[PDB]
Amino acid sequence: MAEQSDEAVKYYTLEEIQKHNHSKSTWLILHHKVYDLTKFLEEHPGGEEVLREQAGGDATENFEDVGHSTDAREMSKTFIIGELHPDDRPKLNKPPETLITTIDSSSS
Numbered sequence: 001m002a003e004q005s006d007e008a009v010k011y012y013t014l015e016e017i018q019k020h021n022h023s024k025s026t027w028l029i030l031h032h033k034v035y036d037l038t039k040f041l042e043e044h045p046g047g048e049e050v051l052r053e054q055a056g057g058d059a060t061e062n063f064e065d066v067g068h069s070t071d072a073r074e075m076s077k078t079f080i081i082g083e084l085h086p087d088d089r090p091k092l093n094k095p096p097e098t099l100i101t102t103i104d105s106s107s108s
């Protein structure tokens with residue numbers, strides 16, 4: 001990716017992470033950041049099989065519903081290899097002034 005090592009956020013193409021939804025290399029996207037479980041497949045409670053189905057793309061189905069617990073919020077941090085490419089990063093015009101919270105009755 002050129003340069004000494006890095007500079008800013010490393011992205012990964014949406015078209016690419018899709019190709020890493022399988023045994024030989026398992027990535028996933030919970031929402032925005034891409035993770036890897038290529039070796040981790042075995043280390044994670046009841047994974048391997050059920051990962052492949054949610055990996056490469058969005059996996060937050062089970063994550064939004066059940067929510068995991070504190071443990072998984074804190075441990076996962078080194079699983080995060082980077083973000084998703086500008087395929088998703090701006091989406092539209094990229095939120096200029098906060099996500100929404102626009103004109104909430106009175107002064108912001």
Ligand code: HEM
Nearest residue numbers: 035045046050051054059062068069070071072075076079
């Ligand atoms: C971002 C990558 C992930 C990491 C680092 C991670 C981390 C963990 C950790 C630390 C636990 C144990 C305690 C807890 O619930 O907090 C756990 C359990 C579990 N995780 Fe994950 N997890 C990840 C993604 C996923 C995804 C995408 C799924 C489903 C497709 C999933 C399904 C489960 C289930 C089901 C358990 C509990 C065992 C069971 O009841 O079968 N996890 N995870």
